């Protein structure tokens, strides 16, 4: 027997393309003229994600991308 | 001592490469500074982002961590090791680095001694 093609489905299921963001570190910190630094993003309460691993400021929740911890 | 001040950083950077104690890039450097596992930092004077410089300087100052200035980012990257060696021996492929953090020192007395003396002279 020979293989039939039958090439017809939903036109194209596209693959997710990751967003390109330039200098994402900067928006985590706010700066005053005096030289102070304030951390805009919350720090996760988990063990590993404690100091430099910031959370996600979603419109209705806080989300840590490293351990899937979520808060209201 | 015999080695120059500006050329004595190569030994420390090579030994940190070998012992895997380098944080490269602004994001890794900032995360290491927040983790305060850093020992010293290396900054590139030649840059087009004043906010980059302010953030690195303030993070170094507010974590009482010594900071070093380098001429250009491409030489910084060549020291760092993000390069490939040609048949003749020159690094045709160089990707520059703007900030570096040394997490673990290499077990070298001579390399650390000159940098510590320079930091004490600065203070
Ligand atoms: Zn977490």
Q: How far apart are CA B54 and CA B60, in angstroms?
A: 10
DSSP letter string over chain B?
A: --S-STTTHHHHHHHHHHTT-EEESHHHHHHHHHTT---EEEEES--S-HHHHHHHHHHHHHTT--EEEES-HHHHHHHHT-EE--SSS---EE---SEEEESS--S-HHHHHHHHHHHHHH-
* Three-state secondary-structure class, residue A30: strand
Q: How far is CA B103 from CA A8, A10, A71, B39, B67, in A?
A: 56, 51, 32, 6, 14
Q: Does A68 touch chain B (CB under 8 A)?
A: no
**Structural domain tally of chain B?**
1
CA B20 to chain centre: 13
Query: What is the domain extent for residue B63?
Result: 1-123
Resolution, expressed in angstroms to one decimal: 2.8
Tokens for A63?
Answer: 């989300």
- Say how many CB pairs under 8 Å bridge A and B: 36
Compute φ and ψ for B19, nearest 5 degrees: -95, 5
The CA distance from B108 to B93, in Å, is 29
Q: Locate B111 and state its tokens.
A: 């390399």
CA nearest neighbour of B67 among B45, B83, B86, B87: B45
Residue of B30, B49, B52 with shortest CB distance to A52? B30
Sign for the pseudo-dihedral over CA of B54, B55, B57, B62: positive
Minimal CA separation from B110 to chain A, in Å: 32
Q: Which of B91, B86, B81, B65 is nearest to B9 (CA)?
A: B81
A44 in a labelled binding site: yes
**Which DSSP category does A62 fall into?**
E
d(CA B44, CA A69): 36
Distance from CA of B70 to the nearest CA of A (A): 21
Residue A40: domain span: 1-72
Q: CA–CA separation, A27 vs A10, rounded Å?
A: 40
Q: How far apart are CA A50 and CA A41, in angstroms?
A: 12
Q: What is the total count of domains within chain A?
A: 1
CB-based contact (8 Å) between B32 and chain A?
A: yes
Q: How far apart are CA B38 and CA B62, in angstroms?
A: 13
Angle between helices B26-34 and B50-62 (to 10 degrees): 20
Structure-determination approach? cryo-EM
């Amino acid at each position: 027997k020979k293989r039939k093609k039958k090439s017809c489905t939903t036109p194209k299921k596209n693959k997710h393309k990751r967003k390109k963001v330039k200098l994402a570190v900067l928006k985590y910190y706010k700066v005053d003229e005096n030289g102070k630094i304030s951390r805009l993003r919350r720090e996760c309460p988990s063990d590993e994600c404690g100091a430099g691993v910031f959370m996600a400021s979603h419109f209705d929740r806080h989300y840590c991308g490293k351990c899937c911890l979520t808060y209201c | 001592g015999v080695m120059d001040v500006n050329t004595a950083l190569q030994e420390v950077l090579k030994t940190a490469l070998i012992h895997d104690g380098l944080a490269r890039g602004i994001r890794e450097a900032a995360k290491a500074l927040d983790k305060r596992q850093a020992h010293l930092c290396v900054l590139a004077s030649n840059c087009d982002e004043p906010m980059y410089v302010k953030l690195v300087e303030a993070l170094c100052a507010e974590h009482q961590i010594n900071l070093i200035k380098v001429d250009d980012n491409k030489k910084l990257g060549e020291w760092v090791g993000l390069c490939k060696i040609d048949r003749e021996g020159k690094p045709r492929k160089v990707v520059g680095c703007s900030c570096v953090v040394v997490k673990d020192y290499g077990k070298e007395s001579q390399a650390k001694d000159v940098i510590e003396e320079y930091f004490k002279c600065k203070k």
